[PDB]
Amino acid sequence: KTYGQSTYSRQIKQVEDDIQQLLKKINELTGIKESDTGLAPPALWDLAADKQTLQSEQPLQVARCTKIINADSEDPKYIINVKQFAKFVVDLSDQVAPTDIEEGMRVGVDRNKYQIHIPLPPKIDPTVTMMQVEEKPDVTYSDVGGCKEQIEKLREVVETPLLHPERFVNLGIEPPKGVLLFGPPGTGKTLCARAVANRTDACFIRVIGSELVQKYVGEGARMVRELFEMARTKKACLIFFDEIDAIGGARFDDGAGGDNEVQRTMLELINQLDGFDPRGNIKVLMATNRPDTLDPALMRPGRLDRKIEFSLPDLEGRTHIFKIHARSMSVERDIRFELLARLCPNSTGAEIRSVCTEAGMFAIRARRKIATEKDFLEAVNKVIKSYAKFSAT
Amino acid sequence: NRCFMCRKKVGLTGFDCRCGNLFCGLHRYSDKHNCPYDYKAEAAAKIRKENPVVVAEKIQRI
Amino acid sequence: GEPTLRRAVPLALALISVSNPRLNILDTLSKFSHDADPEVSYNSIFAMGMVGSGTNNARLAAMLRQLAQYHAKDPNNLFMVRLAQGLTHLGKGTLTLCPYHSDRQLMSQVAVAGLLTVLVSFLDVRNIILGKSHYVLYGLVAAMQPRMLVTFDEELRPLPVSVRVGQAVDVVGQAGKPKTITGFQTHTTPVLLAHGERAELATEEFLP
Numbered sequence: 001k002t003y004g005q006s007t008y009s010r011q012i013k014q015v016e017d018d019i020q021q022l023l024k025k026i027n028e029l030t031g032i033k034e035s036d037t038g039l040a041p042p043a044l045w046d047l048a049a050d051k052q053t054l055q056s057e058q059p060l061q062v063a064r065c066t067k068i069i070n071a072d073s074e075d076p077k078y079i080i081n082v083k084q085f086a087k088f089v090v091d092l093s094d095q096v097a098p099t100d101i102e103e104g105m106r107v108g109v110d111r112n113k114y115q116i117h118i119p120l121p122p123k124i125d126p127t128v129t130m131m132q133v134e135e136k137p138d139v140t141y142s143d144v145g146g147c148k149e150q151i152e153k154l155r156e157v158v159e160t161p162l163l164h165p166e167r168f169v170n171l172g173i174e175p176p177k178g179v180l181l182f183g184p185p186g187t188g189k190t191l192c193a194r195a196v197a198n199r200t201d202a203c204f205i206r207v208i209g210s211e212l213v214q215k216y217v218g219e220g221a222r223m224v225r226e227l228f229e230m231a232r233t234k235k236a237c238l239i240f241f242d243e244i245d246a247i248g249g250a251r252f253d254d255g256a257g258g259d260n261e262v263q264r265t266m267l268e269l270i271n272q273l274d275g276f277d278p279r280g281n282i283k284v285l286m287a288t289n290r291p292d293t294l295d296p297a298l299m300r301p302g303r304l305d306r307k308i309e310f311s312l313p314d315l316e317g318r319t320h321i322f323k324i325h326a327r328s329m330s331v332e333r334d335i336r337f338e339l340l341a342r343l344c345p346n347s348t349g350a351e352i353r354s355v356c357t358e359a360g361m362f363a364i365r366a367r368r369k370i371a372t373e374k375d376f377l378e379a380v381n382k383v384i385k386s387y388a389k390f391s392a393t
Numbered sequence: 394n395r396c397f398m399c400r401k402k403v404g405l406t407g408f409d410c411r412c413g414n415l416f417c418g419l420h421r422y423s424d425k426h427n428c429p430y431d432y433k434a435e436a437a438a439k440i441r442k443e444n445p446v447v448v449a450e451k452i453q454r455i
Numbered sequence: 456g457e458p459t460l461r462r463a464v465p466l467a468l469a470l471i472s473v474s475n476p477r478l479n480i481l482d483t484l485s486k487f488s489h490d491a492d493p494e495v496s497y498n499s500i501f502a503m504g505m506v507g508s509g510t511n512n513a514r515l516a517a518m519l520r521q522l523a524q525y526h527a528k529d530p531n532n533l534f535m536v537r538l539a540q541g542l543t544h545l546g547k548g549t550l551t552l553c554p555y556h557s558d559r560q561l562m563s564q565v566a567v568a569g570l571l572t573v574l575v576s577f578l579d580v581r582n583i584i585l586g587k588s589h590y591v592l593y594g595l596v597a598a599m600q601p602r603m604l605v606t607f608d609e610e611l612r613p614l615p616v617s618v619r620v621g622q623a624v625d626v627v628g629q630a631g632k633p634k635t636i637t638g639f640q641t642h643t644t645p646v647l648l649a650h651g652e653r654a655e656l657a658t659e660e661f662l663p
């Protein structure tokens with residue numbers, strides 16, 4: 001049937017479980033009002049349901065939101081629309097200062113007398129609110145070993161001018177805000193993206209290349225407007241594009257009835273990228289697998305300045321990636337990986353992780369604690385032969 | 394309407410260099426009239442105004 | 456301070472229940488400002504000072520509300536009486552802190568006898584932070600890297616000590632309650648390797 005793997009095996013298990021259930025039985029015994037179609041449990045809003053909700057009732061009115069057009073001379077005399085209700089010539093309440101009520105502003109106004117009460121944050125739609133990462137994955141630069149030249153080149157661009165805006169002033173130069181990455185897939189571009197975003201110290205913004213193609217005309221551009229708006233607002237923010245081939249790869253016109261809309265959108269990215277009052281403090285990181293079928297306008301420097309590529313490790317990048325994907329796992333003290341990488345003349349870091357994790361699967365299926373060194377030998381053997389007579393290869 | 398590096402009359406094909414002087418197409422370049430202006434300093438000053446001193450989130454408030 | 460008690464307490468604090476000797480819930484007002492020095496709780500303390508201007512009379516609370524308002528933001532650092540050091544051990548923090556909370560029962564022990572303790576009751580706070588070099592000359596600024604408290608007990612051999620690897624500092628910074636920062640580059644932290652805010656930095660190039 002079974003055996004006692006560790007001494008009091010169930011003796012901790014059911015002892016934990018029955019008191020866990022007793023935590024519930026305490027709650028239903030005491031009486032809990034659950035499933036009241038979207039409310040809070042009474043234990044914490046009973047002592048909040050008092051007149052310290054009327055303090056939210058009377059002191060704060062409905063505060064209908066509206067949008068500002070312009071002002072007048074010597075006085076506010078503000079012209080405002082609500083959204084679709086009507087346009088009025090209204091004035092601010094005495095609770096505000098006649099400074100931060102500049103035009104094109106979403107402002108809260110009284111429902112009764114139509115007087116401005118509050119300045120608001122401008123509008124930003126969810127479709128782009130969701131592409132802002134708002135988080136930094138833990139991707140350390142050491143995890144991207146095997147591209148010392150590339151990570152250095154990128155370091156000179158996205159990192160050094162920002163964290164040290166001193167040398168470039170002491171010599172009088174401008175950093176190349178435009179970086180493109182390319183090379184064969186499964187190589188260390190994404191990793192570089194996540195790692196740079198780790199120490200980004202900036203409003204880093206993901207962009208998925210296909211997210212822009214849409215059903216209506218110009219709306220994708222309307223995205224781009226909000227993009228460069230949130231960019232210019234968030235000082236020292238980064239932008240990442242990925243597989244931009246969908247955007248503007250060519251200008252197919254022999255039979256000019258093919259792709260045009262994302263061509264126009266690509267033009268909007270052109271203008272709002274460079275031309276007519278440059279952006280200021282922004283950095284652009286791109287990456288594609290086929291940087292060969294793109295419109296040369298993006299290929300113009302100033303926009304896409306550096307062309308960093310990630311190659312296939314000759315013999316030693318695969319060794320170090322054995323040290324990267326083989327390090328974060330349990331093995332015996334009898335390691336050696338040069339023997340391994342000498343066995344895989346052509347394999348990527350991704351395949352390296354595939355062999356490292358495939359190493360564990362033997363002990364995993366063979367009821368073992370860890371991937372023993374010799375088990376890792378068996379792993380590289382089955383992946384040496386597997387990759388030797390691989391399906392596609 | 395005339396240049397200053399060669400007194401050659403021009404008219405509407407003259408130039409207005411930073412140093413306030415007009416030049417012909419041959420002398421429009423700062424290296425053809427010895428322009429006495431610190432382009433490097435207006436350098437170290439424009440880049441300093443356009444360059445946002447980034448701040449690693451640390452020692453903010455109280 | 457965390458949102459759980461930070462919100463649950465004012466659920467019994469904004470509602471003072473003044474039918475009691477209300478300066479008990481007002482006493483709890485004071486030491487509910489007991490959290491990691493500065494915080495976004497100025498909304499809470501400030502609002503409860505506005506509703507506490509007229510209500511929760513200033514005859515007995517006018518010192519109290521701003522008293523708790525200002526306690527977090529005194530030198531903007533320096534709260535350590537938690538009976539915790541290094542990561543979890545003990546250390547006084549009780550002889551000096553405790554007599555306040557015992558001295559806070561309800562009433563006119565804030566009037567005559569109280570003013571001796573209530574002001575300087577607890578003063579066993581040992582600074583705040585650890586960003587320091589102390590290489591014998593004391594000139595170093597070694598690259599640190601602030602993060603979250605080390606949550607790890609045993610998972611594997613290549614196991615990440617912290618998660619919030621984003622921030623990176625080098626000099627005097629912010630210790631915070633859940634922080635177990637290590638650093639990188641192996642500029643050589645051989646002195647203690649168990650933290651403690653005055654490391655000596657024996658310098659050495661151990662294959663960097």
Ligand SMILES: Nc1ncnc2c1ncn2[C@@H]1O[C@H](COP(=O)(O)OP(=O)(O)OP(=O)(O)O)[C@@H](O)[C@H]1O
Pocket residue numbers: 143144145146147183184185186187188189190191192289317321324348349350351353
């Ligand atoms: N040198 C390396 N070190 C560590 N891991 C690597 C290395 N090269 C590749 N990998 C692994 O292989 C995967 C592929 O890398 P990456 O995602 O950067 O390639 P990509 O160019 O973005 O892929 P695609 O071209 O298909 O979009 C990564 O998830 C990474 O973990």
Ligand SMILES: [Mg+2]
Pocket residue numbers: 189190
């Ligand atoms: Mg990729």
